[PDB]
PDB file of C-alpha atoms in Angstrom:
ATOM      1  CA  UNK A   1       0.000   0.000   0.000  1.00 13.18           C
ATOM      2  CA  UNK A   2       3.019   2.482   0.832  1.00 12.27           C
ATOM      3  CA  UNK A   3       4.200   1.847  -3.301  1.00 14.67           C
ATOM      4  CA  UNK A   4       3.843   4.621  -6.119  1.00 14.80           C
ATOM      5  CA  UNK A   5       1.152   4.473  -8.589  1.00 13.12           C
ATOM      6  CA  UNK A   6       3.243   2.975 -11.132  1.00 18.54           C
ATOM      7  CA  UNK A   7       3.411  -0.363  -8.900  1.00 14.42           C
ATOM      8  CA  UNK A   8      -0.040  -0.495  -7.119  1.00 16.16           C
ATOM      9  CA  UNK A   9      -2.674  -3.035  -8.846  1.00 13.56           C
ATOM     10  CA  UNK A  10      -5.084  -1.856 -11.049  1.00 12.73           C
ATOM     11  CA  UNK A  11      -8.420  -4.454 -11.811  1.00 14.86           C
ATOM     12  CA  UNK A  12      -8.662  -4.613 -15.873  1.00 15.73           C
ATOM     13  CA  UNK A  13     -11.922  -5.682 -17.728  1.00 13.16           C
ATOM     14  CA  UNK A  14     -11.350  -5.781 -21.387  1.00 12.39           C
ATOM     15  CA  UNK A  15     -14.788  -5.909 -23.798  1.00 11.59           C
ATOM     16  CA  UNK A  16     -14.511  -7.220 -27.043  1.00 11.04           C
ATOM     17  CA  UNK A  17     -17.225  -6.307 -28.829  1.00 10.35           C
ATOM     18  CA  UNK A  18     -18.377  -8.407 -32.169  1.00 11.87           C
ATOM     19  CA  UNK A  19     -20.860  -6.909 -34.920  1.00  5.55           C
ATOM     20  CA  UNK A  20     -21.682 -10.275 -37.466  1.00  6.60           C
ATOM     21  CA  UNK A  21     -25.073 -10.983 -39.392  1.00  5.94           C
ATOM     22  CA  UNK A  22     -27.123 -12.166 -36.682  1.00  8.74           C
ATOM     23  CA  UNK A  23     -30.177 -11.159 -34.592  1.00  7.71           C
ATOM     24  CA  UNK A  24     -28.237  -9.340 -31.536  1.00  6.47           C
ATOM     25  CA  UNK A  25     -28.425  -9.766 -27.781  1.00  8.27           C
ATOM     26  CA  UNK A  26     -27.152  -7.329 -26.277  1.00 10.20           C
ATOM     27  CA  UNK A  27     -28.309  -3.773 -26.499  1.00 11.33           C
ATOM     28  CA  UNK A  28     -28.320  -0.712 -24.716  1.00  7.18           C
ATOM     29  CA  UNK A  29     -30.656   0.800 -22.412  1.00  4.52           C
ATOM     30  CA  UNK A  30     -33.206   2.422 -25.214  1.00  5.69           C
ATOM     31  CA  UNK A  31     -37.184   1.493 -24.644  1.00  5.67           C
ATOM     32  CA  UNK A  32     -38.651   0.245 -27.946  1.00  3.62           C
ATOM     33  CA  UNK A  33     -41.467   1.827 -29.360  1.00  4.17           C
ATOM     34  CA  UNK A  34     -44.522   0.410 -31.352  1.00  2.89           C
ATOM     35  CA  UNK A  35     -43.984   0.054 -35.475  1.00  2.00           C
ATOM     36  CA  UNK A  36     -45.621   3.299 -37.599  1.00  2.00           C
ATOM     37  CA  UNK A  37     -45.221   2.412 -41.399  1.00  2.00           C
ATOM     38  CA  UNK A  38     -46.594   4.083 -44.188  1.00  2.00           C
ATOM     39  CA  UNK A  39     -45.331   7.413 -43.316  1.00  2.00           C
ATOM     40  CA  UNK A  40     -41.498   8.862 -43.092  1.00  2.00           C
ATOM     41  CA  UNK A  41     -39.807   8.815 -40.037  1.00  2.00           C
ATOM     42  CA  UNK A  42     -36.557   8.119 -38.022  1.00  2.00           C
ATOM     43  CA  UNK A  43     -35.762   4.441 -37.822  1.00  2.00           C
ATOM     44  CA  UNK A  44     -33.441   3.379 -35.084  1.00  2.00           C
ATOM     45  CA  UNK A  45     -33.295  -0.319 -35.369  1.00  2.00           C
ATOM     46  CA  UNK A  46     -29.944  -2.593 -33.736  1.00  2.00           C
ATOM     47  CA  UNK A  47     -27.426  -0.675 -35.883  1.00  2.00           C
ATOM     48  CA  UNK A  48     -29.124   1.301 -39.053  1.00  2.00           C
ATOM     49  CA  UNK A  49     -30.306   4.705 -38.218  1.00  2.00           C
TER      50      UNK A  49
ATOM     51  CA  UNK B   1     -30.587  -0.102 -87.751  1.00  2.00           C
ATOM     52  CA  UNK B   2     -31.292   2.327 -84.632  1.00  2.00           C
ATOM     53  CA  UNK B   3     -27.754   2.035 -83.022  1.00  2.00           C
ATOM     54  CA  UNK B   4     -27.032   5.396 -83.737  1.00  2.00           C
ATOM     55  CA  UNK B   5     -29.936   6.251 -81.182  1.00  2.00           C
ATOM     56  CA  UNK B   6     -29.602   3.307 -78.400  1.00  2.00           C
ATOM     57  CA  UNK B   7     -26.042   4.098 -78.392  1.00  2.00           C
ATOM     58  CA  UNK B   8     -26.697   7.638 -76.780  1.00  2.00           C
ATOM     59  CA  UNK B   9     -29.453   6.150 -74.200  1.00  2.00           C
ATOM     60  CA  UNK B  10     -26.628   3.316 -73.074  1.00  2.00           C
ATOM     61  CA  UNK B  11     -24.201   6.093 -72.181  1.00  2.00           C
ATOM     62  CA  UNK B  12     -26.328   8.021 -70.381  1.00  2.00           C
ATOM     63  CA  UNK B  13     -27.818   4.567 -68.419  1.00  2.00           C
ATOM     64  CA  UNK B  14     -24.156   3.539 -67.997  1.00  2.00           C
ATOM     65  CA  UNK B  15     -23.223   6.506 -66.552  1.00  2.00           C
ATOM     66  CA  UNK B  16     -26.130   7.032 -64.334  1.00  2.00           C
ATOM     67  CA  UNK B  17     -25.099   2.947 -63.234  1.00  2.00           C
ATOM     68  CA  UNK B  18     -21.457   4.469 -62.417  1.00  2.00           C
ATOM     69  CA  UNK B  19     -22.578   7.432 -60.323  1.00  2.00           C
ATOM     70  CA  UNK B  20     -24.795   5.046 -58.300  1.00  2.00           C
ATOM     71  CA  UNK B  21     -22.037   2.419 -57.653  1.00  2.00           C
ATOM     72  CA  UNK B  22     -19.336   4.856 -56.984  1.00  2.00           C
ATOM     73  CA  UNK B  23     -21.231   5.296 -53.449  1.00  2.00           C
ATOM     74  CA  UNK B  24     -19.899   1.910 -52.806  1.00  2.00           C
ATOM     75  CA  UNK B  25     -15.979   2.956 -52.380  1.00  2.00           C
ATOM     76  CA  UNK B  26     -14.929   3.552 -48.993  1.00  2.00           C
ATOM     77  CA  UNK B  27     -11.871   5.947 -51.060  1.00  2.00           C
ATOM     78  CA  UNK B  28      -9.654   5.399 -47.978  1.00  2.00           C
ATOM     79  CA  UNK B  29     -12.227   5.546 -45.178  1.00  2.00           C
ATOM     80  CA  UNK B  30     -13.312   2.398 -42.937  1.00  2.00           C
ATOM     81  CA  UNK B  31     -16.819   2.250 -44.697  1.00  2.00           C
ATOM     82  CA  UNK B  32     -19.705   3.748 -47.333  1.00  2.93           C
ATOM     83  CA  UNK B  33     -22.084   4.639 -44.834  1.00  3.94           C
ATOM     84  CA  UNK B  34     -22.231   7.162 -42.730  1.00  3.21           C
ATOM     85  CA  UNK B  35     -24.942   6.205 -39.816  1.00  5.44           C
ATOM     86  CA  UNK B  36     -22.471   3.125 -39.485  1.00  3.83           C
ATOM     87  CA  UNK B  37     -19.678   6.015 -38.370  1.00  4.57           C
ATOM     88  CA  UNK B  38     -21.649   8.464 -36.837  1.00  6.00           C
ATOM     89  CA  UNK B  39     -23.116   6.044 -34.166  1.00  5.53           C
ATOM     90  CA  UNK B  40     -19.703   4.252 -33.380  1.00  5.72           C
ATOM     91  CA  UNK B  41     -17.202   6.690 -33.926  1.00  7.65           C
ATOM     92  CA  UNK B  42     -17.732  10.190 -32.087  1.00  7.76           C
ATOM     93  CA  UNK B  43     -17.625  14.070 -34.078  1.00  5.28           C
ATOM     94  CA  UNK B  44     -14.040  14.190 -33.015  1.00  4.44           C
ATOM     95  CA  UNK B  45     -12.219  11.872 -35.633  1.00  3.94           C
ATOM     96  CA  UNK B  46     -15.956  10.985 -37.715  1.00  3.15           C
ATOM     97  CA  UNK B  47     -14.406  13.919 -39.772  1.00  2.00           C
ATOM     98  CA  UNK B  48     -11.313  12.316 -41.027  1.00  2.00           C
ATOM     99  CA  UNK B  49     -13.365   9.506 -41.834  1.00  3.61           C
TER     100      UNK B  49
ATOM    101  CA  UNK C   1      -3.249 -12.570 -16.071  1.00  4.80           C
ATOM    102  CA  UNK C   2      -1.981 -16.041 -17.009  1.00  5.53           C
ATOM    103  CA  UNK C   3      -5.446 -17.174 -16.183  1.00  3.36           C
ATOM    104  CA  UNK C   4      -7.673 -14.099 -17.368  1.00  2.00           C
ATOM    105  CA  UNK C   5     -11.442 -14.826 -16.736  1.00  2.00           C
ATOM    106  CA  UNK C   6     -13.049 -14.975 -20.201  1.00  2.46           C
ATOM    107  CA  UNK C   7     -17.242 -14.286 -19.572  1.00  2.00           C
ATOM    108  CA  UNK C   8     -19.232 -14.809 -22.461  1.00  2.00           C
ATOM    109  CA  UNK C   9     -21.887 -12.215 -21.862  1.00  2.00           C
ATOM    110  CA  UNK C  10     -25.324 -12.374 -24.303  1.00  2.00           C
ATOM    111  CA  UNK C  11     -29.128 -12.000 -24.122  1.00  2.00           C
ATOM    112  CA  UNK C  12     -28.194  -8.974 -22.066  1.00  2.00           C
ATOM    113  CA  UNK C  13     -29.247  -5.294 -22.003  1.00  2.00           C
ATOM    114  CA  UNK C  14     -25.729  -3.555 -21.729  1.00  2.00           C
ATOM    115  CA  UNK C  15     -25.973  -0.363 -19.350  1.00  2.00           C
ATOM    116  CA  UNK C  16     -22.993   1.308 -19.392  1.00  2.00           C
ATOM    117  CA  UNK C  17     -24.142   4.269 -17.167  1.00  2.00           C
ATOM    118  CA  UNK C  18     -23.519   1.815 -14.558  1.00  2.00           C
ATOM    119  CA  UNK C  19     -19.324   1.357 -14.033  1.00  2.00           C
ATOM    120  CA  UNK C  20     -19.330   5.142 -13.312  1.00  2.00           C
ATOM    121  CA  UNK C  21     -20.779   5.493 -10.059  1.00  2.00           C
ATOM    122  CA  UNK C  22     -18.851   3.038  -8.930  1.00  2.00           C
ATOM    123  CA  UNK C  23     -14.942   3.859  -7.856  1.00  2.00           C
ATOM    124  CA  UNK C  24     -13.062   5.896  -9.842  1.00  2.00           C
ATOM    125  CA  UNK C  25     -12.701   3.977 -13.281  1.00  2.00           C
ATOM    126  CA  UNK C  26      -9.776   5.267 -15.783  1.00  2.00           C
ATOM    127  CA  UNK C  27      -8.566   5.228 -19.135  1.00  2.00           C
ATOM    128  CA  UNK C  28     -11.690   4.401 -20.919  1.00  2.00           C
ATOM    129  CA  UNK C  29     -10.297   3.645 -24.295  1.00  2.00           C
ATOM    130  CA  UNK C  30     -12.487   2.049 -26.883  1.00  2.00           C
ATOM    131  CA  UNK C  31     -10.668   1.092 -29.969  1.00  2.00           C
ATOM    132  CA  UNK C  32     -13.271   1.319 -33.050  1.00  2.00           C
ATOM    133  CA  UNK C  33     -16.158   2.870 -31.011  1.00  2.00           C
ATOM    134  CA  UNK C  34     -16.938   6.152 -28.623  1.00  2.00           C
ATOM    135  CA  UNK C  35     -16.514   5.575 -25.188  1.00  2.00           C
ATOM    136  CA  UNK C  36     -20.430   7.309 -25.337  1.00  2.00           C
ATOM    137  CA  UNK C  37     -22.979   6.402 -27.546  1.00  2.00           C
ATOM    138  CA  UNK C  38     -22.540   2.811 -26.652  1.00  2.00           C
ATOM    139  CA  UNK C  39     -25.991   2.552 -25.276  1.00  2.00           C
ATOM    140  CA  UNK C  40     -28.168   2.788 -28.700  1.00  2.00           C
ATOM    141  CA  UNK C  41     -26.258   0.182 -30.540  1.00  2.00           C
ATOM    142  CA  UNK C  42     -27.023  -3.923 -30.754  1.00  2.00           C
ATOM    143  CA  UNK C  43     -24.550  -6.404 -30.262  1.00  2.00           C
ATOM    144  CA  UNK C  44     -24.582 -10.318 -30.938  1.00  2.00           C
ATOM    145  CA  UNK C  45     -22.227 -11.602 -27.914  1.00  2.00           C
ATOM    146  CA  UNK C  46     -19.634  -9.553 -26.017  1.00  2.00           C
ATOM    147  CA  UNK C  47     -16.920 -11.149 -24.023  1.00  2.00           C
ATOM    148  CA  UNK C  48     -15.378 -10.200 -20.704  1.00  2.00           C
ATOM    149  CA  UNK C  49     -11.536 -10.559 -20.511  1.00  2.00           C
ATOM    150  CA  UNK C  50     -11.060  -9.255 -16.674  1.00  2.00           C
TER     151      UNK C  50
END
């Protein structure tokens, strides 16, 4: 505990991320809302805005 | 007999064809669209891209 | 590190507004994405190298 900062521990947590034609999983914290068609709008689906 | 009219409307179909695939070249850049760098990458470095 | 706990983390909603309240967490550094805007995109199957 009495060490400099270049010698203390430091916890790592490394997240590879993968993007591949599939349904995805895991999303972020964005509440769905219901399907309008027939008339122009934003669409913010998995990863095409 | 009418080549010397079809020839005119195949250049002009051609190169509307080549205008519309030439937005499939990256020229350089990580990808052709730009709501796939926009929502990864942040303003900072989305310009060199 | 010789042993590095690899979590296979899917079927998950990813907040990442979470690992900030906590103690002080530095250099953020994603390679290929924002360190914001991570919470409107879709991914398949992440993994967790800690």
């Amino acid at each position: 505990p009495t060490y400099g900062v270049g010698h203390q521990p430091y916890r790592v947590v490394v997240l590879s991320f993968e993007l591949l034609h599939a349904p995805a999983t895991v999303c972020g914290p964005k509440k769905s809302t219901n399907l309008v068609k027939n008339k122009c709008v934003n669409f913010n689906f998995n990863g095409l805005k | 007999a009418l080549g010397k009219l079809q020839d005119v409307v195949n250049h002009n179909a051609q190169a509307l064809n080549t205008l519309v695939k030439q937005l499939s070249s990256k020229f350089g850049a990580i990808s052709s669209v730009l709501n796939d760098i926009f929502s990864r990458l942040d303003p900072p470095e989305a310009e060199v891209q | 590190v010789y042993a590095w706990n690899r979590k296979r983390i899917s079927n998950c909603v990813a907040d990442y507004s979470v690992l900030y309240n906590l103690a002080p967490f530095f250099t953020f550094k994603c390679y290929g994405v924002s360190p914001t805007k991570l919470n409107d995109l879709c991914f398949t199957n992440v993994y967790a190298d800690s």
